[PDB]
Write an enzyme that holds these catalytic residues in place. Structure first.
Site, PDB file in Angstrom:
ATOM      1  N   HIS A 141       4.145  -7.746  -1.477  1.00 16.22           N
ATOM      2  CA  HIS A 141       4.457  -8.545  -2.663  1.00 16.22           C
ATOM      3  C   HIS A 141       5.933  -8.448  -3.039  1.00 16.22           C
ATOM      4  O   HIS A 141       6.662  -7.555  -2.570  1.00 16.22           O
ATOM      5  CB  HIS A 141       3.566  -8.118  -3.854  1.00 16.22           C
ATOM      6  CG  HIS A 141       4.074  -6.898  -4.549  1.00 16.22           C
ATOM      7  ND1 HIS A 141       5.051  -6.953  -5.521  1.00 16.22           N
ATOM      8  CD2 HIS A 141       3.801  -5.582  -4.352  1.00 16.22           C
ATOM      9  CE1 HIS A 141       5.332  -5.720  -5.920  1.00 16.22           C
ATOM     10  NE2 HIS A 141       4.588  -4.872  -5.224  1.00 16.22           N
ATOM     11  N   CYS A 142       6.386  -9.379  -3.862  1.00 17.22           N
ATOM     12  CA  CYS A 142       7.701  -9.243  -4.461  1.00 17.22           C
ATOM     13  C   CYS A 142       7.573  -9.642  -5.915  1.00 17.22           C
ATOM     14  O   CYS A 142       6.522  -9.381  -6.527  1.00 17.22           O
ATOM     15  CB  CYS A 142       8.777 -10.004  -3.653  1.00 17.22           C
ATOM     16  SG  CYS A 142       8.349 -11.705  -3.250  1.00 17.22           S
TER      17      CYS A 142
END
Lengths: 179, 179
Positions: free
Chosen positions: A117-118
């Site tokens: 994820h970011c």
């Protein structure tokens, strides 16, 4: 120009790029790409069966996700952080091996499931998953980028796309890609 | 313990610390932190507009950078060397004033740009730039360390971090830090 070709695959035809329609998607089997809110929702992660979390936006700014190992302590989820910035200047390719090794740490167990994820699951994390598909699953960049995009709205920055093209060149010439 | 707190900010969650993904970064406006190869690449320095170079690893070992004033003669770049060792025992704080004065010599002109470098741009040079931010720009150590780390992978040794904490204490008590 290869970056323009990749962009053409991603865009909506109006000069624009669709944004994520959900906070998290399984982009390829047992690999999930998502945003900051899903990363920070441990009960949701557990229901999904996530065993590993790669935070590709680790840090303290409004464009980062301020998590750490301790956030996941005693959730049973294994954590790695990469303090990447979403800019054309950030050398994310320096992390491609580090990230692929982590994804493969997870997937090499049959019950492993990894969230990469970011901040938005849009540029930093999709780049790492695409590089992993190329490096470990022998997908050319167009194929890898295309399967991810079909399963999640994504838009890696042009710098990241150029790093993926350079990666593709090397794998192609080394004979490490499926025809 | 304050050093552990600083370390927590720097680490990747696996007990490790990311290494520099590029040879040089602008960590704060007109201040660059970098490695031995960029220090020794005068044409690159000129393209970047570097006017001043602080070698924080000056010396003759495989952990030092064997440059000198004469290396930069007629490049128009102004040079200072500090023969620091990257050990917890090395009293880098004895140089904090010397280094901040040099950085400020550069920045107090509007066109000045300073490279503070060591062997890897990872421990010695980032310590000096952090001390400068604290002493001259009124940043507390956590803020200073955090903005530098966001712009370059860094890992000052624990001795250096402890010297920065002692510095922070003194500046805090003297009323020289921004709240």
């Amino acid at each position: 120009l290869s970056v323009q070709d990749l962009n053409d695959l991603l865009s909506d035809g109006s000069g624009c790029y669709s944004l994520p329609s959900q906070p998290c998607n399984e982009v390829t089997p047992r690999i999930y790409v998502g945003n900051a809110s899903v990363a920070q929702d441990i009960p949701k992660l557990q229901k999904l069966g996530i065993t590993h979390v790669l935070n590709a936006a680790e840090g303290r700014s409004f464009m980062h996700v301020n998590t750490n190992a301790n956030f996941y302590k005693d959730s049973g989820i294994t954590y790695l952080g990469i303090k990447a910035n979403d800019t054309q200047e950030f050398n994310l390719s320096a992390y491609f091996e580090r990230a692929a090794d982590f994804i493969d740490q997870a997937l090499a167990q049959k019950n492993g499931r990894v969230l990469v994820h970011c901040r938005e699951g849009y540029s930093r994390s999709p780049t790492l998953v695409i590089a992993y598909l190329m490096m470990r699953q022998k997908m050319d960049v167009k194929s890898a980028l295309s399967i991810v995009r079909q399963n999640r709205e994504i838009g890696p920055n042009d710098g990241f796309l150029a790093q993926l093209c350079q990666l593709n060149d090397r794998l192609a010439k080394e004979g490490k890609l499926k025809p």
